[PDB]
Amino acid sequence: MKVKKWVTQDFPMVEESATVRECLHRMRQYQTNECIVKDREGHFRGVVNKEDLLDLDLDSSVFNKVSLPDFFVHEEDNITHALLLFLEHQEPYLPVVDEEMRLKGAVSLHDFLEALIEALA
Structure with missing residues (x-):
């Protein structure tokens, strides 16, 4: 098929400049440890893994954390x-x-x- x-x-999806707080929240809503990321035009950028956000300030961006x-x-x-x-x-x-x-x-x-x-x- x-x-x-x-x-x-x-x-779970966020935009590339989402805060760490926002990304963590989306993953909690889907009871998961991955978030798919897009840019402002809707293009695929990568994924954020929960483990990569552990030691980050909640107000900081996920921009440099995409994988x-x-x-x-x-x-x-x-x-x-x-x-x-x-x-x-x-x-x-x-x-x-x-x-x-x-x-x-x-x-x-x-x-x-x-x-x-x-x-x-």
Whole structure:
């Protein structure tokens, strides 16, 4: 099946200049340790890992704390391609982008596994 079938909008996201406080809050709302980051035009920038914010002032920015700029798949990829990205990094949410690198959603690791349960029994 295709990635587009499994995309969700229900995932943790902040803008690149969000404060540490804001990022931590988003991750708490999703009970998770990853936040996907976009820039002001909606392009994908990378992800913030919770562990990287431990010793930061809450008022400071996440701008310099982004990681994994290469961790994404495209809308029109096969869900089998997402397997290769999750093998590289087992993050709970895999960013999904269009051809101009605009963030279009995410594939949750959970939903990816559900795809594999279907593609098999």
